[PDB]
Design a protein around this ligand. Structure first.
Ligand SMILES: CCCCCC(=O)OC[C@H](COP(=O)(O)OC[C@H](N)C(=O)O)OC(=O)CCCCC
Ligand SMILES: CCCCCC(=O)OC[C@H](COP(=O)(O)OC[C@H](N)C(=O)O)OC(=O)CCCCC
Ligand SMILES: [Ca+2]
Ligand SMILES: [Ca+2]
Ligand SMILES: [Ca+2]
Ligand SMILES: [Ca+2]
Ligand SMILES: [Ca+2]
Ligand SMILES: [Ca+2]
Ligand SMILES: [Ca+2]
Ligand SMILES: [Ca+2]
Ligand SMILES: [Ca+2]
Ligand SMILES: [Ca+2]
Length: 1695
């Protein structure tokens, strides 16, 4: 249907804006202005409009008449998610008010905020609404509502108007918000709920143990939120697998749509609050496209994610994850839903229905389970932070694989407990080595492989395309020549051509195919055909690749939106690290990324059978913070169990399972024997409580025995033998214990190690052979979470014996203390383990007190040849571990060159950064660069002999991440976190790939924002038999300290940096003293230049010498350019020179340069330039000129470069920046830089200096004239929605406020006032202009604030100190206000631009300028030289000055910023500032911008006769006596209602009055509307000026001298669009007045009463009933209007 395609078009227009990044807090402001009502229903109504936006309802005050006018603007300040605001509704609803009764409903229109947010201009511009009654929508429209609604986000601005009458304010059929093609039909989404499964326990579970099934302790129901309405299903009592089967009939109207269906399962509770199970969403644009199709979805499961499944009686701290906020860390069950979009049948009361039985029969084919086998090979778990407890890894997909719900059979889906060992430098790692732990588990999910094959293939397409675009971007960035770019682009387009002929998998023959599957396959086929055809067109058409790069970037995002799959029913694989018995960290791998497909490798996942690197996160961290818990590399292979034999091609190594059998003995009389075993069996298990036998273990199907039963005492020796490192810092801990409140003493375990038990003293430590000590003494560590003495404290509570956590402070309840000691380094076995007690912890050697022993009696099982490595899935405790038969030796070199924009984490505004370079089980620390935020380490970090297991091609495909953690070194305390950069090294395996690695700026991520960048690269060379294939060692500037080699280091060249040290502004006090003697230091590339010291900053705010010069070596590449460092030093007594300010400038590309390169006043001028005033009282025809209205700031006009062309803006900072934001702005340095290369030898002369034409740096007194014109759409600061604004201007030490001349009760104030001050630039450059709300009995509110750099106005080359007008006048209201004549300004710009001095001709009609010649006739054409013009030479010299790109005479619209919403408009201030420095003379006469007074007007009407008025029903006399009397008034002046005398003996509508009405009113002919001033009520503080259009509403009325007043009709005349009357009453008939809703609208003949002053004719009055208009009669008028003097010329009576 036609409604289907336009709904799909609306949903795709929704789709192309649902891609902005959703900040969870975001301030928003919505301006809803109502303007004018038209054709409102009813008779003699009193219309009112109530607008409800986001729960806040505003209210315009009462008007009367069926065509009202309000012109009141409403503000809505909300704070919510930006995606949530586009689903909220704006409900503007019209009532008919009454004096003594409640308001009755008269109309309604609901439009969502989304439509006014995708609308161009970020808003809608005065569109008309189709008001309809919500319960009476079948009877047609009830009126029209001209509204203009706005959306202002953070950083957004509103657009200006454009002339407001040419296609606006009339013939409203061309100005609908929704045209006639958009129906008002309902859209009904049949959002069906079928069932749910695996819902976690949310009940107390103690009442069920009384009964003498425990997983079913939840009472779920579905709550669905959609456009604010909430529908809840029935409650299923005590069932974790509920069977709701209920349709939910969501309903919206076509004007107001909602995108985000929110499904939230809640656990119903009888007493307490309803718990949250999980929250998943439907996005309607993701399930729709535009040929196109409606939203369709399901039947498919949606997985819920949230809090961990462990039930606690206490409130779970991760319950915020259950509401959909955050990503969610654990599987919360899943719900089977369906969606269908219908457009008819609008079900009013059956919101909840049962599912029909045929739909239950259909849904069974989407519920079929398939067996899935998942394996995970844990390769390396490094970057650990503690050693206190053993670490386990659990793999679970869905509810399958949870190791805590022990009510069912455990699936053996977790590793065993591995205790980390120190890597020698900073971190820890689990010592897996050649024995990787393998986790195998079996789940059951629906076979939805027809979706995930397509998802994986299009994702592989997008990844190949992204790799080729990264190669092409490196090609264009590196200036690689054109033939290589042509070859790479041809390879790229060949990749696109070869890829996009891929056919999507067929939906035929598969039970799980939905309607959305067919529509998605059709859309994907159409998109792939379009991409393939456009690629085969462009491969033969296009030649330039930079033009096609933009289309290719669109193709990449098109491929990204093609991989979106809302029907991904496979839950994510969640890997949990369990330290002890507690959940610690999580990672969610999507199941499609590891799912195996038989359709090919592209249809399989990206990391299917490959060792991916994942960083775990803490359960409520949005990003990685100071501590990453563990970096985990794991080879995850998920697949169907029917094709699990294909796992053999992905498996590496040999999988190995061990049977274990334990025999115990004891010692008496010097001989070991079987006596004395009490409580533990002779043959038993690992715990000794369960008796086992050697014959109890037999291999299952697919396994076989390898070897014989052997003793295994070699577990102690084979734990890597500490041979993986050459430099190692050993660590020995010390432990003490005490009573609570007692004295400290050493414990029985006085010294511990990484084994978690007792060890030898530090004096007894000896090096192994091949090792030696670096230092002969130990030392304690301060760089941890400890106090100044290196001690941390813990508390023990029984029955626990040892602490589980430590803190840095000592309390009276702490019973343990621990200290870490470090020392650096360079370069029996009878088959039994012995312990002191039976069933105790056995040790590798017999101690003095050991009297019991045991041994391990184990046999190896190998997989058979008939099964391969797939036998690990057929075991279903067994332990499966993959053993690698060989090791590969690598060699990693990290070239850490420099860093930029690091955080200031010291009190002296800098840091001491160093880098922990970590790569698997190896780590090394770079040196510390002191007192900088932009270090240059210039260092190479070499990890010789790194053992990485697996084939070298798997390390080529998925290299391990090199993770660098930057830290601010502190001499005391703990070193603070700067950030973390994660990047991959380039991999080399032989000599044919020996290209030089390229340094790249990788981000230093702290929190969720990039706190700087680091220039670093790495390479990982595969070592052969020895180090011969490795490259040579880099040169050393220090022992064991390698320099970055010549190939990797950027090539430096000699280049000059010129610094314009102009001056310092707003220097705040440092150490409670003013900055009296500052200086500037500019450092770049290790070489600094220092300016002269200012003797007094208050007396002279500018440096005496403004030019600085330094020769530095900087890289030739613009990417490799180091940051520019500015430090402001303060010179104080006793030689003290602290740093009081610092800024980092990294965007140095803007600094590179080629060194060899009827009455007329000002409001007539203002209204003519706006364009809304024209062709009505215009003054352009007299030959005058206009001005340039800027819709933004003058510093936001791109023609003037932000007015920083002389010297830019750099804020200075100081001190530690908490919560990784920018530090406090304690000053400002003003200056600019010019960087240009230099010759290497002095034989070539130096390039010329770039700063030669500097102005004088002394302070100058300036006369600042601030002309403030008007304010536009200010934020209301009163309870009535209005404001009483005035102007408060602060300028240095002079503050001028105008509270005595405030403008009462306006949101659009006409200020029109001058505020002249004298300020000394640049000490008082901070011109702050603020608007303030007057309040009589309470505090004032700040409407807005803006800052103008007056020194930018003074010192710019664009002449922004005074805007040049288009004409040079010497009289009138357009008199030249600048101090300097246009000849002098032309001379100034000529000597500024390097042009020679301009020459006046012998007659003044030519001036030579800038190598060209100018004539008077070139600019004076098509203009009238009236009497106010000045000299012709100054005229043409001003005419030259307009073509120079200077600032014209302007009224800039400055944004009013406030702290209430920081980067959002709180109003606007049309104004301008002229700066007049006193050095070049006094300025001219100022402009008079005083607002013009409204001239008096007298409207006179005369009512001659009436005809065919509706007769009365029954009077006192008992006839058809309609006592006709005619009353009429100008609206706005309802207190001046005038009525005629009562006519009598009327039985046919005939009346005779000859009674005259007079209404005076104040009018502006320019703005074409009038003002009436009256108070709001008797207790209002001041009068309000109402700006309404001129019109005249006159109603026929039945007198009823002895009865009640009865209405007859009404008639309206807009005085600018007065309809042409008929010359005779019989020619007057119905519907020459405009009709808008009853029949197909036609424009009426109109003429202005102001232009055509008087005419006589007949006008029809009408009344409306039953939705139709009837003729209520005719009235004879002579409508005349006069001004004041014409009214005084001829007085009139009877009024
Ligand atoms: C022995 C248990 C007696 C339990 C007796 C009892 O009446 O418990 C009711 C509640 C738990 O019930 P909820 O449905 O709120 O749990 C839902 C859960 N809060 C959630 O957010 O998931 O317990 C407490 O408030 C305090 C329990 C303190 C238990 C020490
Ligand atoms: C609708 C009328 C209700 C009845 C009157 C009523 O409650 O008025 C409230 C206002 C609040 O003052 P503002 O108008 O500045 O509101 C400021 C604004 N809220 C803001 O955003 O800051 O006036 C007083 O309190 C004056 C008390 C004088 C006592 C002598
Ligand atoms: Ca509960
Ligand atoms: Ca419950
Ligand atoms: Ca509860
Ligand atoms: Ca610090
Ligand atoms: Ca420090
Ligand atoms: Ca106020
Ligand atoms: Ca006020
Ligand atoms: Ca107030
Ligand atoms: Ca009557
Ligand atoms: Ca009557």
């Amino acid at each position: 249907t036609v409604s289907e395609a336009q709904l799909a078009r609306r949903l795709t227009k929704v789709k192309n804006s649902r891609r902005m990044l959703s900040n969870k807090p975001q301030d928003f402001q919505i301006r809803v202005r109502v303007i004018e009502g038209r054709q409102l229903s009813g008779n003699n109504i009193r219309p009112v409009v109530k607008v409800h936006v986001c729960g806040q309802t505003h209210r315009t005050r009462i008007k009367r008449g069926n065509n009202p006018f309000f012109d009141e603007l409403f503000f809505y300040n909300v704070n919510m998610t930006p995606s949530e605001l586009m689903d909220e509704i704006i409900s503007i609803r019209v009532y008919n008010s009454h004096s003594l009764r409640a308001d009755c409903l008269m109309g309604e229109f609901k439009i969502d905020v989304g439509f006014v947010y995708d609308e161009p201009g970020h808003a809608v511009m005065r569109k008309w609404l189709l008001l309809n009654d919500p319960e009476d929508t079948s009877s047609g429209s009830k009126g029209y509502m001209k509204v203009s609604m706005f959306v202002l986000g953070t950083g957004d601005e509103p657009p200006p108007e454009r002339r407001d009458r040419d296609n606006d304010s009339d013939d409203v059929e061309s100005n609908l918000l929704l045209p006639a093609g958009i129906a008002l039909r309902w859209v009904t989404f049949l959002l069906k709920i079928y069932r749910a499964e695996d819902i976690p326990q949310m009940d107390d579970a103690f009442s069920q143990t009384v009964k003498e099934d425990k997983k079913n302790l939840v009472d779920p129901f579905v709550e669905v939120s959609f456009a604010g309405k909430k529908v809840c299903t029935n409650i299923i009592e005590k069932n974790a697998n509920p069977e709701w089967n209920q349709v939910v009939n969501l309903q919206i109207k076509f004007p107001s749509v909602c995108e985000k269906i929110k499904l939230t399962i809640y656990d119903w509770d009888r007493l307490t609050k309803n718990d949250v199970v999980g929250t998943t969403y439907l996005h309607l644009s993701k399930i729709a496209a535009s040929v196109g199709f409606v939203p369709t979805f399901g039947p498919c499961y949606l997985n819920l994610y949230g809090s961990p499944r462990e039930y606690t009686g206490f409130p779970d701290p991760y319950d915020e994850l259950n509401t959909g906020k955050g990503e969610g860390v654990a599987y919360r069950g899943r719900i089977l839903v369906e969606l269908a979009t219908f457009l008819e049948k609008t079900p009013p009361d059956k919101k909840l229905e049962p599912i029909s039985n045929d739909d239950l029969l259909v849904v069974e084919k989407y519920q079929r389970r398939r067996k899935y086998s998942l394996s995970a090979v844990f390769h390396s778990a490094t970057m650990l932070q503690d050693v206190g407890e053993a670490i386990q890894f659990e793999v679970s997909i869905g509810n399958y694989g949870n190791r805590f719900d022990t009510t069912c059979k455990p699936l053996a889906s977790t590793t065993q407990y591995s205790r980390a060992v120190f890597d020698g430098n900073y971190y820890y790692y689990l010592p897996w080595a050649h024995t990787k732990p393998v986790v195998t588990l079996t789940s059951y999910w629906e076979d939805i492989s027809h979706r995930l094959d397509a998802v994986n293939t299009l994702l592989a397409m997008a990844e190949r395309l992204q790799t080729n675009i990264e190669a092409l971007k490196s090609g264009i960035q590196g200036k690689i020549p054109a033939n290589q770019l042509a070859e790479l682009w041809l390879k790229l387009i060949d990749e696109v051509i070869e890829d996009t002929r891929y056919t999507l998998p067929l939906t035929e023959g598969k039970a799980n195919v939905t309607v959305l599957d067919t529509q998605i396959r059709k859309l994907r086929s159409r998109s792939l055909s379009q991409i393939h055809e456009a690629a085969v067109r462009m491969r033969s058409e296009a030649t330039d690749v930079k033009s096609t790069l933009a289309e290719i970037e669109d193709w990449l995002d098109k491929l990204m939106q093609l991989t979106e799959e809302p029907q991904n029913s496979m839950p994510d694989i969640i890997i949990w690290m369990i330290r002890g018995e507690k959940r610690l960290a999580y990672a969610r791998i999507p199941a499609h990324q590891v799912l195996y497909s038989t359709s090919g490798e592209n249809a399989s996942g990206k990391y299917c059978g490959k060792t991916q690197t994942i960083f775990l996160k803490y359960p409520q961290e949005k990003n990685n913070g100071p501590k990453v818990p563990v970096e985990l590399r794991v080879n995850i292979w998920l697949g169907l169990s029917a094709v699990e034999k294909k796992f053999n091609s992905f498996a590496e190594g040999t999988f190995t399972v061990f049977a274990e059998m334990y025999e115990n003995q004891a010692l008496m009389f010097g001989k070991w024997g079987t006596s004395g075993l009490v409580g533990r069996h002779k043959f038993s298990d690992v715990t000794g409580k369960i008796k086992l036998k050697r014959e109890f273990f037999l291999p299952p199907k697919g396994w076989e025995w390898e070897g014989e039963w052997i003793v295994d005492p070699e577990r102690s020796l084979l734990t890597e033998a500490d041979a993986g490192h050459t430099e190692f810092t050993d660590e020995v801990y010390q432990n003490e214990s005490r009573y609570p409140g007692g004295d400290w003493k050493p414990a029985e375990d006085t010294y511990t190690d990484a084994n978690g038990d007792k060890a030898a003293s530090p004096s007894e430590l000896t090096c192994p052979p091949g090792w030696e000590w670096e230092d002969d003494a130990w030392s304690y560590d301060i760089n941890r979470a400890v106090d100044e003495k290196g001690w941390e404290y813990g508390i023990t509570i029984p029955p626990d014996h040892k602490p589980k956590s430590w803190v840095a402070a000592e309390k009276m309840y702490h019973t343990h203390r621990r200290r870490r000691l470090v020392r650096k380094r360079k370069k029996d076995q009878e088959g039994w383990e012995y312990a002191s007690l039976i069933g105790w912890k056995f040790h590798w050697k017999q101690r003095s007190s050991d009297t019991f022993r045991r041994r391990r009696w184990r046999r190896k099982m190998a997989p058979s040849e008939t099964h391969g490595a797939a036998a690990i899935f057929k075991l279903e405790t067994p332990i499966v571990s993959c053993n690698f038969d060989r090791v590969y030796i690598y060699h990693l070199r990290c070239y850490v060159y420099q860093a930029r924009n690091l955080l200031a984490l010291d009190k002296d505004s800098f840091s001491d950064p160093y880098a922990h370079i970590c790569f698997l089980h190896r780590s090394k620390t770079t040196e510390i660069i002191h007192s900088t935020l932009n270090p240059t380490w210039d260092q190479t970090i070499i990890f010789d002999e790194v053992e990485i297991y697996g084939e070298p091609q798997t390390v080529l495909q998925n290299p391990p991440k090199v993770i660098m953690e930057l830290f601010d070194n502190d001499q005391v305390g703990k070193d603070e976190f700067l950030g973390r950069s994660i990047f991959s090294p380039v991999v080399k395996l032989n000599s044919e790939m020996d290209i030089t690695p390229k340094l790249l700026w990788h981000p230093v991520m702290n929190g969720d924002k990039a706190c700087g960048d680091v220039l670093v690269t790495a390479e990982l060379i595969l070592r052969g038999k020895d180090g011969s294939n490795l490259p040579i060692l880099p040169p050393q500037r220090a022992p064991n300290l390698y320099m970055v080699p010549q190939g990797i280091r950027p090539v430096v060249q000699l280049t000059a940096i010129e610094i314009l040290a102009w001056g310092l502004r707003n220097m705040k006090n440092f150490q409670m003293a003013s900055i009296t003697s500052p200086s500037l230091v500019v450092e770049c590339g290790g070489e600094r230049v220092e300016s002269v010291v200012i003797k007094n900053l208050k007396k002279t705010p500018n440096f005496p010498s403004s030019v600085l010069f330094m020769k530095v070596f900087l890289p030739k590449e613009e990417l490799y350019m180091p940051p520019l460092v500015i430090k402001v030093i303060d010179h104080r007594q006793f030689g003290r020179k602290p740093v009081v300010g610092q800024c980092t400038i990294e965007r140095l590309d803007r600094f590179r340069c080629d060194p060899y390169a009827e009455i007329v006043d000002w409001w007539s001028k203002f209204y003519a330039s706006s364009g809304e005033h024209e062709k009505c009282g215009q003054y352009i025809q007299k030959g005058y000129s206009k001005l340039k209205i800027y819709n933004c700031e003058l510093e936001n006009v791109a023609e003037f470069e932000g007015l920083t062309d002389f010297s830019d803006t750099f804020k200075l900072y100081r001190g530690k920046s908490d919560e990784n934001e920018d530090p406090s702005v304690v000053g400002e340095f003003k200056g600019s830089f010019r960087i240009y290369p230099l010759p290497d030898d002095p034989s070539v002369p130096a390039p010329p200096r770039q700063f030669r034409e500097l102005p004088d740096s002394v302070p100058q007194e300036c006369t600042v004239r601030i002309y403030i014109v008007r304010g536009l759409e200010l934020q209301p600061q009163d309870n009535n929605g209005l404001c009483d604004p005035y102007i408060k201007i602060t300028l240095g030490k002079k503050v001028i406020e105008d509270r005595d001349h405030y403008i009462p009760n306006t949101l659009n104030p006409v200020f029109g006032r001058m505020y002249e001050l004298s300020c000394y630039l640049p000490q008082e450059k901070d011109l702050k202009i603020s608007v303030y709300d007057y309040d009589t009995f309470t505090r004032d509110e700040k409407v807005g604030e803006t800052i103008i750099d007056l020194e930018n106005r003074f010192l710019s080359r664009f002449g922004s100190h005074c805007g040049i007008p288009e004409e040079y006048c010497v009289s009138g209201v357009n008199t030249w206000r600048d101090q300097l004549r246009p000849t002098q300004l032309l001379q100034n710009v000529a000597r500024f631009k390097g042009f020679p001095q301009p020459i006046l001709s012998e007659d003044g009609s030519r001036i030579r300028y800038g190598g060209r010649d100018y004539s008077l006739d070139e600019f004076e054409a098509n203009k009238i030289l009236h009497q106010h013009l000045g000299a012709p030479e100054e005229r043409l010299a001003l005419h030259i000055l307009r073509t120079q790109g200077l600032v014209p005479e302007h009224v800039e619209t400055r944004t009013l910023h406030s702290t209430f919403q920081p980067n959002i408009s709180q109003g606007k201030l049309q104004m301008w500032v002229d700066v007049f420095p006193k050095s070049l003379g006094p300025p001219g006469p100022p402009f008079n911008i005083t607002p013009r007074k409204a001239k008096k007007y007298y409207l006179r009407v005369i009512i001659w006769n009436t005809k065919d008025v509706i007769l009365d029903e029954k009077s006192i006399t008992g006839e058809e006596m309609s006592d006709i009397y005619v009353k009429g008034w100008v609206p706005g002046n309802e207190e001046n209602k005038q009525k005629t005398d009562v006519h009598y003996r009327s039985l046919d509508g005939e009346g005779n009055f000859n009674w005259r009405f007079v209404f005076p009113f104040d009018y502006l002919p320019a703005e074409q509307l009038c003002i009436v001033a009256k108070k709001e009520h008797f207790w209002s503080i001041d009068q309000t000026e109402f700006r309404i259009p001129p019109r005249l509403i006159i109603q026929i009325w039945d007198n009823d001298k002895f009865s009640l007043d009865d209405y007859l009709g009404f008639l309206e005349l807009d005085l600018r669009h007065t309809i042409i009357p008929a010359k005779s009453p019989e020619k007057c008939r119905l519907d020459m007045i405009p009709d808008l809703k009853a029949m197909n609208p036609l424009k009426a003949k109109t003429a202005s009463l102001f232009e055509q002053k008087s005419m006589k004719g007949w006008w029809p009055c009408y009344a409306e009933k039953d939705g139709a208009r009837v003729m209520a009669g005719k009235v004879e008028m002579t409508l005349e209007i006069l001004n004041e003097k014409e009214a005084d010329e001829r007085p009139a009576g009877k009024g």
